[PDB]
């Protein structure tokens, strides 16, 4: 093995921001790098547009105008004075012409067209792909360094098959017979806790395989280190009748051979305006610009030597996804956790070794959910106990594995839901059905019969899960997966290790999080950190179907390789670094299995048949472009609008699906501007009050008002107009799904911001604030 | 129908007749998470174990009290008005329909005492919304 | 009545089906969803006997049918009045088959008899 | 004229008091449950030995919606 | 603002001086796809290509 691409699965997220480096973001290449970065800008800013426009200026432009100034505006009057400003690739050229017909007056006239298109736009999160030279074992050592005459050529082929694939009712693997993995317990299938449902086809009126091929969008392209021009990945729907161009993404390669992959613009649409997307997942007549596919490369060196990066051990994949609306807020269980769990078998979790750095991510991610979900701000007894420990600089007690601390550790561990799903149940027919004795999540279809009172407390976290469709099933609610619950159980029991250096940096959770963040940033294995960073920000449950990807990812059958390599640091595991690659069909878009299905429906029996890699059905795991994302909701916007709260008859805690990436309760900018400042601030308005009123008040009173404002959390669905605005607006669930198609790009984006002098108010120095146009 | 009328601007939220048909209330559940002083000799203090509540700094204890005091609930969410359950539609019209049966389960606001607010900023008299859902 | 081709060539695959009234959990509580009644009549008395149950079972009275026996020993079974109703007026039956919170007076069951001649 | 036949339904002679009066298959019913029901010694064979309510339980509730 | 072209009609004149007026193609549309026209007469955010207006002419004979 000679050269290898990293990451093995790249991720790019859609946004209406432009596909240019200064105005875009990059998928994390190091976990936890930017958790407290209060200068982050995930929306396009006025400053950014001003600079890009100033940098488009002269160029000789500023006196090729003066040239024109004394010569008097007509047509090539202005077409000359375009071009000099290379802005055609950001704004359609005529709108630029419309701009100058109605007249430093040129700067303002073109800044307003840029602002109309891009101001406050959701920036695209692009993925950098790197080539690494390997070893005698194939271990990455260093990024490829091109010398004179060396050339890298990348190839990308992607597709979207959502409109071609099957309905998503629930995860088919919930009925798949197994011995159990690190991600999913044998009990779910064995005891029928959440049976897999059959699924009919999407767009069922398109019949015969050959006509259904039109439902698949696909495109490809190539770029080289000899030319940094961007190449669009453009397909058509219906594919080859009136047709729509679908920008699935864009690719760039720079001087040093790095591939930058931009996702699409976030455009979803029906073939007829009256076909509304009223279902969370399955909407006929719709297409979106999500895609996924195969990334390969060829390295040509000065010496004629040529190396092909196309095998599945050194090739890569790319998938595009909905935006991340809280990029610094990490899912409690990530897709990288699924990769790690997929390589473990449930019965060998006895042999698992636990450090405190394997347990800390669970507690840290949960603690930070307070910024996106109300229940974790004010209804989570573990987050409150962590606050109690921080108050007295006593968080380090949790790192104590001795007997004097067992009851402290156990008290926290016992609040977590056990992924065996065999606790808090009563059995009928010990034919056995496991019926939860804790709080159930009812169906909307009500029955006026007295609910059975819950005898068992609700465990953590307070999120729905794969079995939501079945009231009374333990799998209605989310559990950290078996291998992570084992880590926590080892922690509680005292069978864990930790270093003294860690203890000394563990007086508060934030201090230790900053310490562990530094361990990532100084870990020398950049190829494997980049593989992990691309996935540590993606959700890993529940899957109904999820946010970015769904349940095939939690099975080892989807990987051609999945190996433990190393701790993040020699002495600190932090859940580990792994070499993993996806199973790939090496023919890509030209695979004979590109357009395969299972007939009128898909069912778990089809998945059962696919386990055997020699079977006819094994193509299910050997991914062709489009295969990773076809399971998800079409369009993704209606799935996002459905990925929010699920209310119970009991008001609190409010269950939330995926709040780390699609927040539910946020802290608006409006509130930030009412607790930002201290009473001493040299400002005519302080926290929304006149200087005189703000300083005429007691200090206690001033600080109390800060905290009240800080305490006001806003439903994320209300950060834009999702059908609830206006006199007699209907609001409600279904209007949210319809309106999200246009309003996704106006939803609030959560961003770390400073509080420079919190005083005694109780407000942390770093807060996470939701910016939108309506909540300012 | 006598509740909030939302504008494109988030704040302030317009309300019709909130003095008699409240729009945002302070639930019982929150009241039980701020009415106790750290001094209380109970196994549960403001929704926390005795050990946790007394182990934190007094500063922190009072801040948690005021955070709870500041959580206001949509009055229409104080009983099941069509928004409860997996894939519940919710929305304006289901509120009109369900109120026929649910008016009698809507939260009722009543003055309640806070014996020792200390330095929390909570007034000695609060007005708390009682309903079966929000308790 | 049905060709093997339907199953063999997967012409119309059977679909999984969830429970009606799924918020009623545990078999014991789900017994409340079943409406039942019984009765007996004789040749010696022509009086009609109603078959009346309750929903939810042990609230609304549900007349599932009526039975009679004339002096010649022939049984006459009348069905219900065609009354269907939700437990709450706002629960509307918008699905062709599966509407939670609804009962009707349809039924079916077991018909037995015993003959008793004069010679004992 | 298509003939005359003697036929009888399978019945549970305990009727309302049968121990299978209230049996089901858990959270869903599927064809695998009907496959197992063919074996007369299975835990599922009760599907074919009718107790009161067993013939009409499949039909629409209420019947009026199914008729429309 | 994102604007739509609306063909309200077409006009021809032949060599005999006859004006021929064609109406539009029948295209109606909302400014947003989700704005549905559920009222018989009053639907906000819609436009159609119906029109009406004024017809005038000028006759110019050989003798000026
Ligand atoms: Mg996030
Ligand atoms: Mg009043």
Chains that touch C (3 or more CB pairs under 8 A): A, B, D
* Residues paired with residue E19 on neighbouring β-strands, in sequence order: E13
b/e sequence A243-262, b meaning 16+ C-beta within 10 Å: eeebbbbbbbbeeebbbbbb
From the list A336, A333, A352, the residue with the least C-alpha distance to A483 is A352
> What span, in angstroms and rounded, lies between the C-alpha atoms of A33 and A54?
31
Tell me the sheet residues that pair with C78: C66
Q: Which whole-number Å values give the CA distances from A308 to A2, A135, A153, A297, C107, in the listed order?
A: 9, 16, 10, 6, 72
Strands (E), chain C: 17-18, 49-55, 60-69, 75-79, 85-86, 102-103
Give the residue from A239, A288, A236 showing the smallest Cα distance to A265.
Answer: A288
- For ligand 2, the distance from its centroid to the CA atom of residue A682, given in whole angstroms, is 41
Q: Can you tell me the distance from the alpha carbon of A304 to that of A372, in angstroms, rounded to the nearest whole number?
A: 54
Contact A79, A88 (CB under 8 A): no
Please give the structure tokens belonging to residue A107.
């700067």
Q: Is A416 left (phi over 0), alpha (psi -120 to 50) or beta?
A: beta
- Treating both helix axes as pointing N-terminal to C-terminal, what angle do A381-391 and A406-413 enclose, rounded to 10 degrees? 150
In chain C, residues 18-37 whose CB comes closer than 8 Å to chain D:
18-20, 27, 30-31, 34-36
Cβ <8 Å between A194 and D27: yes
Which tokens go with B86? 């997996």
The first and second tokens of residue A28, run together, are 């994390």
Q: Which residues sit opposite B48 in a β-bridge?
A: B45
Distances in Å between the alpha carbon of A60 and those of A67, A70, A100, A318, A385?
A: 11, 17, 19, 41, 63
**What are the tokens at A747?**
């939803």
CA within 13 Å, CB half, A500 = 0
User: Using a CB-CB distance cutoff of 8 angstroms, which residues of chain B are in contact with residue C90?
Assistant: 97-98, 100-101
β partners of residue A245: A236
- The CA–CA distances, whole Å, from A235 to A207, A249, A255, A288, A289 equal 22, 10, 28, 11, 9
Q: CA A121 to CA A115: how far, in whole Å? A: 9
Resolution (A): 2.2
Q: Which ligand is nearest to the CA of B21?
A: 2
Q: From the CA of B126, how far away is ligand 2's center (Å)?
A: 15
DSSP conformation letters of A293-334: EEEEEEEE-TTS-EEEE-STTT-EEEEEE---S-TTS--SSB
- Look at E29 and A273 and tell me if their CB atoms are within 8 Å: yes
Whether residues C14 and D30 touch (CB distance < 8 A) is answered with: yes
Token output for E32:
């947003």
Which residues of chain D does A177 touch, with a Cβ-Cβ cutoff of 8 Å? none
What does the block give as tokens for C91? 């629960």
Put simply, the answer to whether D52 touches C14 (Cβ < 8 Å) is: no
Would an 8 Å CB–CB cutoff place D61 in contact with chain C?
yes
Q: Which residues contact E5 (CB under 8 A, 6 or more apart)?
A: none
> A606 exposed, middle or buried (CB, 10 Å; 0-12, 13-18, 19+)?
middle
Distance CA A35, CA A31 (A): 9
Q: Pseudo-torsion of CA A130, A131, A136, A137, nearest 10°?
A: 50
Chain A residues whose CB is inside 8 A of the D28 CB are 195, 197
Q: List chains adjacent to chain E, taking adjacency as at least 3 C-beta pairs closer than 8 Å.
A: A
Of A263, A222, A267, which Cα lies nearest the Cα of A245?
A: A267
Token output for A649 = 């008859």
d(CA A670, ligand 2 centre) in Å: 29
Identify which of A109, A285, A95 has the alpha carbon closest to the alpha carbon of residue A206.
A285
Contacts of D68 in chain C (CB under 8 A): 96
| Neighboring chains of D (3 or more beta-carbon pairs < 8 A) | A, C
Q: How far is CA A425 from the centre of its chain?
A: 33
What's the token pair of residue A269? Answer: 């649409």
Alpha carbon of B3 to ligand 2 centroid (Å) = 14
**Residue B9 touches partner A, C-beta closer than 8 Å:** yes
Q: Which residue has the tokens 């009962």?
A: C103
Q: What token pair was written down for A557?
A: 């059958």
Please indicate whether chains D and C are in contact, defined as at least 3 beta carbon pairs under 8 Å: yes
Contact A466, A543 (CB under 8 A): yes
Determine, for residues A473 and D27 on separate chains, whether the beta-carbon distance falls below 8 Å.
Answer: yes
What's the CA gap between A716 and A673, in Å, rounded?
18
Of the candidates A151, A140, A167, the one whose C-alpha atom is nearest the C-alpha of residue A223 is A151
* Beta carbons within 8 Å of A605's beta carbon, 6+ residues apart: none
CB contact under 8 A, B133 and A391: no
How many Å is the maximal CA-CA distance in chain E? Answer: 60
H-helix segments, A633-727: 636-642, 669-675, 691-696, 699-710
Q: Is B19 flagged in the annotation as binding?
A: yes
Q: Which tokens sit at A47?
A: 């400053």
Q: Which residues pair with C102 in a beta bridge?
A: C86
Q: Strand, coil or helix: what is A701?
A: helix
Decide if C16 and A599 are in contact by the 8 Å CB cutoff: no
Query: Which residue in E has a C-alpha nearest to residue A738's C-alpha?
Result: E34
Spatial contact of A661 and A540, defined as CB atoms under 8 Å apart = no
Does residue A442 sit at the C interface (CB-CB below 8 Å)?
yes
Please tell me the distance from the alpha carbon of residue A42 to that of residue A124, in angstroms, as a whole number: 9
- What burial class does residue E21 get, using C-beta atoms within 10 Å of its C-beta: 0-12 exposed, 13-18 middle, 19+ buried? exposed
With tokens 């911001």, the residue in question is A753
Residue A460 β-bridge partners = A416
Q: How many CB atoms lie within 10 A of CB E46?
A: 15
Q: What Cα–Cα distance (Å) separates residue A35 from each residue in A518, A753, E42? A: 11, 11, 51
Q: Do D27 and A192 touch (CB under 8 A)?
A: yes
- Could you check whether the bond before residue A10 is cis, i.e. omega within 30 degrees of 0? no
Check: CB of residue A581 under 8 Å from CB of residue A1: no
- Inspect the interface and report whether the beta carbons of A274 and E36 lie closer than 8 Å: yes
Determination technique used: X-ray
Please give the residue of chain A at the shortest CA–CA distance from E38.
A274
Cα–Cα distance measured from residue C52 to residue C79, given in angstroms and rounded to the nearest whole number: 11
Distance separating alpha carbons of residues A407 and A403, to the nearest angstrom: 8
Residues of E in contact with A738 (CB under 8 A): 34
Decide: helix, strand or coil at residue C100.
coil
Q: Do the Cβ atoms of B21 and B75 come closer than 8 Å?
A: yes
Q: What is the DSSP letter of A457?
A: P
* Chain D residues whose beta carbon lies within 8 Å of the beta carbon of residue C35: 53
Query: Where does chain B show beta strands of DSSP type E?
Result: 24-25, 44-45, 48-49, 73-74, 108-113, 125-130
Give the distance (Å) from ligand 2 centre to CA of residue B120.
Answer: 27
Binding site for Mg(2+): what residues of A are annotated? 324, 326, 329, 660-661
SS3 annotation, A239-298? CCCCCEEEEEEEEEECCCCCEEEEECCCCCEECCCCCCCCCCCECCCEECCCCEEEEEEE
End-to-end CA distance of chain B: 25
State the SS3 of A593-651.
CCCCCCCCEECHHHHHHHCCCCCHHHHHHCECCCCCCCCCCECHHHHHHHCCECECCCC
Confirm or reject contact between C88 and chain B (CB < 8 A). yes
CB proximity list for E64: less than 8 A, separation 6 or greater: none
SS3 of chain E: helix, strand, coil, percent, to 5: 0, 20, 80
Spell out a b/e string for A374-413, using b for 16 or more CB atoms within 10 Å of the CB, else e. Answer: bbbbbbbbbbbbbbbbbbeebbbebbbbeeeeeebbebbb
What are the residue ranges of helices labelled H in E1-64?
A: none
> Please, do chains C and A touch (3+ CB pairs < 8 Å)?
yes
């Amino acid at each position: 093995c000679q050269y290898k691409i990293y990451p093995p699965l790249g991720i790019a997220r859609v946004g209406n921001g432009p596909a240019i480096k200064p105005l875009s973001l990059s998928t994390p290449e190091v976990p936890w790098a930017h958790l407290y970065d209060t200068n982050v800008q995930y929306l396009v800013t006025q400053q950014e547009l001003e600079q890009l426009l100033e940098e488009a200026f002269g160029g000789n432009v500023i006196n090729e105008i003066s040239q024109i100034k004394t010569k008097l505006f007509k047509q090539e009057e202005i077409e000359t004075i375009t071009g000099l400003l290379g802005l055609s690739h950001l704004v359609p050229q005529q709108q630029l012409s419309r701009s100058l017909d109605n007249l430093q007056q040129i700067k303002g006239a073109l800044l307003k067209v840029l602002s109309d298109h891009y101001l406050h736009a959701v920036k695209k999160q692009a993925q950098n792909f790197y080539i690494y030279k390997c070893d005698e074992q194939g271990n990455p050592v260093e990024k490829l360094k091109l010398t004179d005459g060396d050339k890298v050529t990348w190839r990308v082929e992607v597709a979207n098959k959502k409109s071609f694939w099957y309905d998503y009712n629930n995860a088919l693997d919930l009925s798949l017979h197994t011995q159990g993995s690190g991600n999913l317990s044998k009990n779910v299938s064995k005891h029928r806790l959440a049976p897999a449902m059959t699924a009919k086809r999407r767009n069922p009126n398109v019949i015969t395989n050959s006509l259904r091929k039109q439902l698949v969008i696909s495109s490809q392209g190539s770029v080289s280190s000899d030319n940094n021009t961007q190449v669009p990945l453009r397909g058509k729907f219906p594919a080859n009748q009136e047709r729509h161009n679908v920008l699935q993404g864009s690719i760039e390669c720079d001087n040093e051979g790095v591939l930058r992959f931009y996702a699409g613009n976030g455009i979803s649409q029906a073939l007829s305006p009256s076909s509304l997307n009223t279902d969370f997942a399955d909407n006929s007549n719709w297409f979106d610009d999500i895609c996924d596919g195969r990334v390969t490369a060829v390295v040509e060196l000065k010496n004629g030597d040529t190396f092909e990066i196309q095998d599945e051990q050194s090739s890569a994949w790319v998938a595009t996804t909905p935006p991340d609306y809280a990029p610094q807020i990490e899912p409690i269980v990530t897709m990288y956790d699924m990769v790690s769990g997929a390589a473990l078998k449930e019965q060998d979790l006895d042999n698992l070794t636990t450090q405190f750095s394997d347990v800390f991510p669970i507690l840290y991610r949960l603690y930070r959910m307070q910024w996106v979900n109300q229940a974790d701000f004010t209804d989570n007894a573990v987050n409150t106990q962590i606050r109690e420990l921080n108050s007295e600089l006593g968080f380090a007690q949790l790192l104590d594995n001795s007997a004097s601390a067992k009851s402290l550790r156990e008290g926290i561990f016992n609040q977590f839901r056990n992924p065996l799903f065999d606790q808090d149940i009563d059995v009928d027919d010990p034919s056995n059905e496991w019926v939860s004795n804790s709080r159930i999540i009812p169906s909307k279809d009500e029955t006026n019969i007295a609910a059975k009172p819950a005898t068992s407390s609700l465990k953590l976290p307070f999120y729905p899960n794969d079995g939501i469709d079945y009231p009374g099933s333990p799998v209605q609610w989310f559990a950290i997966p078996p291998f992570m619950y084992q880590h926590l159980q080892n922690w509680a029991a005292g069978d864990f290790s930790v270093t003294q250096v860690e203890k000394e940096s563990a007086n508060t959770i934030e201090e230790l999080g900053l310490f562990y963040s530094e361990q990532f940033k100084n870990s020398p294995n950049s190829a494997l950190l980049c593989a992990r960073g691309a996935l540590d920000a993606l959700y890993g449950g529940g899957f109904h179907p999820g946010v970015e990807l769904t349940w095939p990812m939690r099975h080892n059958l989807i990987y051609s390789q999945n190996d433990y390599v190393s701790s993040v640091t020699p002495e600190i595991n932090l859940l580990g670094l792994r070499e993993f690659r996806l199973k790939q069909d090496l023919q890509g878009l030209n695979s004979p299995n590109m357009y395969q299905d299972f007939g009128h429906v898909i069912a778990v029996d089809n998945v059962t048949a696919s386990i055997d890699p020699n079977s006819d059905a094994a193509w299910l795991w050997r991914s062709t472009p489009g295969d990773l994302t076809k399971w998800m909701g079409i369009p993704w916007q209606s799935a996002a609008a459905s990925c929010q709260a699920v209310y119970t008859p009991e008001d609190f805690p409010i269950p939330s699906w995926w709040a780390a990436n699609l927040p539910v309760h946020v802290l608006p900018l409006a509130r930030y501007n009412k607790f930002k400042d201290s009473q001493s601030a040299d400002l005519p308005e302080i926290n929304g009050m006149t200087h005189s009123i703000a300083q005429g008040m007691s200090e206690e009173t001033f600080e109390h008002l800060r905290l009240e404002q800080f305490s006001q959390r806003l439903d994320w669905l209300h950060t834009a107009d999702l059908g609830f605005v206006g006199y007699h607006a209907e609001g409600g669930y279904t209007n949210g799904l319809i309106q999200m198609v246009s309003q996704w790009k106006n939803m609030a984006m959560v961003m770390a911001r400073p509080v420079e002098n919190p005083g005694s108010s109780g407000i942390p120095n770093v807060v996470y604030v939701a910016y939108s146009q309506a909540d300012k």
